[PDB]
Structures are given as structure tokens and as C-alpha cells.
Design a protein around this ligand. Structure first.
Ligand code: NAD
Ligand code: NAD
Ligand code: 3HB
Ligand code: 3HB
Lengths: 342, 342
């Protein structure tokens, strides 16, 4: 109802990252959890005075549960979403939604059939500075987007959230956010992708870096670069605020590295603490409110979908679209040619 | 001799940009000029008490001239270099060397045959911060280059030098970018994929681009440029402008926008006032000396070529190679496909 009664499937790293949000947002009450590990279940029952289960059948069968947050490893998402849906539970599943388009399709179908909402976990494209930059684009204040340039230099490869890195770890985890933000901002279909990955650390035989071109319906183009190898830190270019809102040198908004949106008549630079507008008339630092609850935008989509029936932007269809781009990046770098997106 | 005796062909915008350099560098004496404009000739005779001519035949026939600086519009370069060479004058020609590979070939051949040195005008790849970053890469200190990311957001399209506008921002602006990237990686470009953007009717030329470059040995670069004068990426180069000025009279080095060089074991960020090295052990701001003469690196190549016979890095062959990449960018953007380089 007023307090969304949330069950959690998979009490891992994603869950723990999401916890301050679920704790501090007054719209959420944690009512149950499942986890195959006894020590996680035990932690949760203690922490939230709440029933726990070894699996999703148990969580999904608890009728007090209204919605299930899926933070299990990716290969259980499709199954866990299916079971939640069968039992009339709305679903918030972490990025990645799934690692195949087939899993995603099934997920969409099952939630569609059960008549429950399907929203995809935390993605940085939920972050207020991007929603706000999206608002500018959609307002027509600067005309349509023509070019987007995005870059993130991080230490993901060596100081990550571990179980995400199946090959292309930084694509499915890191490019997911980047592509999502770019899609949010441009607001049209990706039609073509061309990607180069870099992989130059034997100790870490996975792709740690990439550069990609994206062509969008309507003729806007994006370039996105990522480097996970932990040397230069591009938070220097985001007013020295880290990914999770923290100060580097009472939080600010989350972000995913320097991004410049070029509209026909001006540039938008979303920052963790403001949105900078460069138009031919004025140069503007437009203030943002400091978030009281981190990642509250995630809870907004969920709360409004379940309580008010408002179709959420970050649905299954949306997330599957980002997955498809991510698969296309990997195919492009792997094969050395363009991928065309239907 | 000790003072290189320099004739100037074409007293245009390039010349005037180069002038503080030619004035202040003690190795240079301006001894003669040609220009089809009587008012430019008159200005020069007055300023430098020096003989002037309507054309290159006159400048080339002055036997006191040791070297000729060609600052004429591009379509006269090949002819003016041919004539200089015929008369045993060394040649410094502005970027662009020429706009066709045929012109360039002729230029190389003529200077080769006459036994005179051929160097290509100012290019930002001459700038000390890049030479210094090059020194690090070539030293093996951080291992080979694996990735380069370069971007420049400027007001070129609307506040340019103006006789530089086919594909104006490619031949003028991407020339510097590609040159810097070539200098830094230090191997051949093998492949290019480019998108250009052109979204101002009042300015029906390409004002923006993003391109992928593959290099021999597997390094890749991505380069982005946007000339539409909104965001100003000098913000990311310690607020120092292209020509070394402060944008918050001793000045700093010249540059061509934010560049990050990823070597196998570290990143190099060349800045107008330092070279930042991010290696696994330490993060280092390596200081540079403030130049006494702007663009002295250009006079170093010329002076050392003519007086000491040291083959210059920025020769005709080198410059032609950047032109070839630039043609390839335009061909790639213009068509929907990769261009492979010989
Ligand atoms: N690591 C991150 O920061 C992060 C962020 C975004 C999304 N994700 C996604 O969420 C997934 C969950 O892993 P994590 O990164 O949160 O850390 P993690 O591996 O510590 O957490 C996953 C935990 O979920 C539990 N789980 C629940 N149901 C399960 C089932 N049926 N079978 C097996 N285990 C089950 C397991 O005990 C497992 O340890 C990741 O694989 C990734 O796909 C992770
Ligand atoms: N505009 C710049 O700042 C800049 C920078 C780098 C290189 N360049 C290159 O140098 C070229 C020179 O133009 P500019 O931009 O310096 O400005 P500009 O057009 O003011 O100067 C070029 C002048 O050279 C003179 N000239 C000399 N010999 C000539 C000849 N044989 N025929 C005709 N004119 C002759 C002309 O009077 C002409 O006006 C440009 O076209 C460009 O290719 C320009
Ligand atoms: O959504 C997240 O929790 C997250 C945070 C860090 C990186 C990543 O892959 C995802
Ligand atoms: O090399 C130059 O003199 C120059 C100066 C500014 C920008 C440009 O296109 C070229």
C-alpha cells in the first residue's frame, strides 16, 4: 500500500549497495528474503525480524510480499522473475536484467501475463542529474540531440563489485550504465554500433576498456569510452564527486563519469551536484537538490508503478534494449565489424 | 647561419599567428616576404626594413633567403614549394601541407631532389607537453600505448581563423588531433571509422565528429571534436587556452584539448603546464618549463634541420600521412564505412 512490502531474493553485493536506499526510503518495508546461504538468511532474519527462505518459491509464496527485488546472480534472474510473476509479485531485478535476449523476452512475457510490473534494478540512468538533463532535451529548449560524448575512467577491474567479472565483464556491468544514460538522453533507437575493446592485463584476462560509436535513429551519434584499469580517475571532471555521491579531495547525486550532450542549440553537462547548460545566450550552472535518500529515483519508479500504475521508464523492454546494445558492442569488438540493430 | 634567414610567402592569418614566434626566437631573422597584396607587402617592408615581392619567384630569387615559410592558402603550397626547392631554399609550409596526396607527393619529391628540408608549419603535435608525453612512451616506462582518448570542444565554427572554411573542421582541426595521436602512439594508423555532425544551416559545414582509429600493434584511439562553441573543454586542461593563455605576461604551452594516453601500465595526461602520470605506484604531476618563445618547437625542427642536418620529425612524409588519415575520416563519414589505410 503506502509502505511497499518488499521481499529480497539474493542478499549479495547488489543488495548491500541498495540497502541504505531500502532502509532510508519511508515507502519501503523489507518483509522477507531468500538466499541459499544460511549466514545471509540468518543476518536478514536478525536485522529485519523477518521470515527467510532458502529459495524463491518460499519468498514468492509469502502473501505479505507485494514486490520482489531480485539481486541474485544473473543466471537465476529469468527463473526468479518467472516464479515471482506466477505468484502475482511485482519485480525489481538488478542490472543486468539477464545476459541473453531470450531470458529477457521470457521475463517480459511472464510479467506481462501475470499483470505485474517489471523494473530493472539500479541503473545510473535513474540518477537525478540525467533525468533532469533528459527533461531539458524533451522540453525542446535546446532542440534535438545531435551528439553525445561519454567517458568513464575507473578502477573497476581491480576494485570492483566482484561477481560481475562469460567473457565481457566491463561491457555487461559498466557499458550497461553508459549505454543506458546515452539512450535516456538521446531518446531514440540505437541503429548501429562499432566497438573496440582493450585487454592488456594478463592477470585480468577480460576486456578492461573500450571505445564505441553509436548511430541513433534521427542522425544523432554518440561516442562512449570506458577504461577500468584504475589509473586516471575521471571523477576529477565531475567536480571530484565519486560514483556513489561521495566527496573526493550529506551526499550528492550518483553519476557514471563525464558526459556532454550536444543539442542543436547547446550542450548539457549533467553533474552530481548540478546541470550545466551552455547555450549561445547564457552559460548556466542549474542547481540540483541534494538527495535525502540515495537512489530514491529507483523507488519512485517502483512505488509509482505498483501503487499508482504509472508505466515506469526503466521497464523490461527498456533494459532488454540496453542489453541488446551491450551484446552488439561485444560482437562488434569480437568480430571487427559493425552490428546493425533491428 | 647562427640566425636562420627566413623568407615568408603569404602574409596571412597563419603568418600573423606565427609572428610572435618569428619575432622573439633569436635563431630567426625575417629577411624577405612575398604577397600578392600590396598592403601586406607594404606592411612587411615597413615592419622589417625588408625587400618584398608580388610572388614566390621573387622571394625564391633573393639569395640571402635560406628558408621559406609558406603561409599562403593551401592551393599554392605545391607550386610555391616546388619553386623554393628549385632555388635551393628549405621549406616550412603551414598546415595543411596541401589538400591532396598528389600535391604532397610532388612537394616531397621536389624537396628531395633539390636536397632541401621540408617541414610542415605549426601543428599542435609540436607542442612540448606532447613531445614530453611521447618521451615517456618511447622510454618504455609505462609499456606500450594501448588506448588514447582525445576530445576538443571549441568555438572554431564561429570564432575561427576563417580561410580554412570540403570538410573544414577535419582538414584544420582533426589534422592537429590525428597528428598528436600519431605522435603519441608512434605506429601507423591502419583503419578509421568516422561520423561527422552538421547541424547548423547558417554554417553548412561539418562542425563536429567522433572517430575510431586502429593502430599497428593493436592500440586504438577515439577522437572527438565539436566546434559549435558551447561547452569549452579548456575547463579540463587547467583552464588554459589553445595558445597558452589563462582563462580562469608569462604564458603556458599550447595544446589541443583533453587527451588521455593509456599505456599498459599507466596513463599519461599531457597538460599545458605539466604532464600527469598515473601509474600503479604513484600519481605524479611532472612540471614543465614555461616556454620563453611560443611554438619554439617549430623553430627547433627548422633550425636543427637546416643548420645541423637533423632529420625533422614533422617532415613532408609525416604531414602527408596525417592528411591521408584526414581524407580517410571524411571518406568514412561521407560513406557509411571503414577506410583501410595502406
Ligand atoms: N556486484 C554489484 O555491484 C552488482 C551491481 C549491479 C548488479 N549486479 C548483478 O546482481 C548479481 C548478484 O550478485 P552481486 O554482485 O549482487 O553479489 P553476490 O554474488 O555477493 O550476491 C549474489 C548472491 O545471491 C544469492 N542468491 C539468491 N538466490 C540465489 C539462487 N537461486 N542461486 C544462487 N545464489 C542465489 C547467492 O547467495 C549469491 O551469493 C550479479 O551477478 C550481477 O549480475 C551486481
Ligand atoms: N587560418 C589560420 O589560422 C591557419 C592556420 C594554419 C594553417 N593555415 C593555412 O594557411 C593558409 C593561409 O591562409 P590563412 O588562414 O593563413 O589566412 P589568409 O587567407 O589571411 O592568408 C593567406 C594570404 O596569402 C597570400 N598569398 C601568398 N602567396 C599567394 C599566392 N601565390 N596566391 C594567392 N595568395 C597568396 C594571399 O594574400 C592570402 O590572402 C590557409 O588557407 C590554411 O590552409 C591557416
Ligand atoms: O547498480 C549498482 O549497484 C552498480 C554499482 C557499481 C557498478 C555496477 O556495475 C553497478
Ligand atoms: O597551426 C596554427 O597556426 C593554427 C592555429 C589555430 C587553429 C588552427 O586551426 C591552426
Amino acid at each position: 500500500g503506502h509502505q511497499l512490502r518488499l521481499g529480497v531474493a539474493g542478499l549479495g553485493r547488489a543488495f548491500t549497495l541498495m540497502l541504505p536506499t531500502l532502509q532510508q526510503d519511508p515507502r519501503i518495508k523489507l518483509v522477507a528474503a531468500c538466499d541459499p546461504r544460511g549466514s545471509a538468511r540468518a543476518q536478514f532474519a536478525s536485522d529485519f525480524r523477518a521470515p527467510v527462505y532458502p529459495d524463491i518459491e518460499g519468498l514468492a509464496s509469502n502473501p505479505d510480499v507485494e514486490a520482489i527485488y531480485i539481486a541474485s546472480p544473473h543466471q537465476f534472474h529469468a527463473q526468479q522473475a518467472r516464479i515471482a510473476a506466477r505468484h502475482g509479485k511485482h519485480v525489481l531485478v538488478e542490472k543486468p536484467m539477464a545476459l541473453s535476449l531470450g531470458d529477457c523476452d521470457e521475463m517480459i512475457q511472464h510479467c506481462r501475463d501475470a499483470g505485474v510490473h517489471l523494473i530493472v534494478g539500479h541503473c545510473h540512468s535513474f540518477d537525478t542529474p540525467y533525468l533532469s538533463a533528459r527533461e531539458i532535451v524533451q522540453s525542446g529548449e535546446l532542440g534535438p540531440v545531435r551528439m553525445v560524448h561519454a567517458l568513464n575512467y575507473t578502477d573497476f577491474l581491480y576494485r570492483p563489485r566482484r561477481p560481475e567479472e562469460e567473457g565481457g565483464g566491463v561491457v555487461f556491468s559498466q557499458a550497461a550504465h553508459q549505454v543506458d544514460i546515452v539512450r535516456l538522453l538521446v531518446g531514440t533507437r540505437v541503429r548501429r554500433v562499432r566497438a573496440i575493446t582493450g585487454d592488456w592485463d594478463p592477470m585480468r584476462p577480460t576486456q578492461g576498456a573500450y571505445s564505441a560509436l553509436l548511430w541513433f535513429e534521427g542522425g544523432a551519434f554518440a561516442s562512449i569510452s570506458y577504461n577500468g584499469y584504475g589509473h586516471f580517475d575521471s571523477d576529477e571532471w565531475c567536480d571530484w564527486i565519486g560514483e556513489m555521491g561521495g566527496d573526493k579531495s550529506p551526499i550528492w547525486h550518483q553519476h557514471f563519469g563525464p558526459i556532454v550532450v550536444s543539442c542543436e542549440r547547446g550542450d548539457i553537462r549533467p553533474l552530481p551536484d548540478s546541470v550545466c547548460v551552455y547555450a549561445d545566450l547564457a552559460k548556466e550552472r542549474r542547481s540540483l537538490q541534494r538527495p535525502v535518500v540515495p537512489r530514491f529515483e529507483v523507488i519512485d519508479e517502483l512505488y509509482h508503478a505498483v501503487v499508482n500504475e504509472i508505466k515506469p521508464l526503466h521497464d523490461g523492454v527498456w533494459a532488454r534494449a540496453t542489453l541488446e546494445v551491450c551484446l552488439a558492442l561485444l560482437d562488434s569488438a569480437g568480430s571487427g565489424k559493425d552490428v546493425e540493430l533491428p
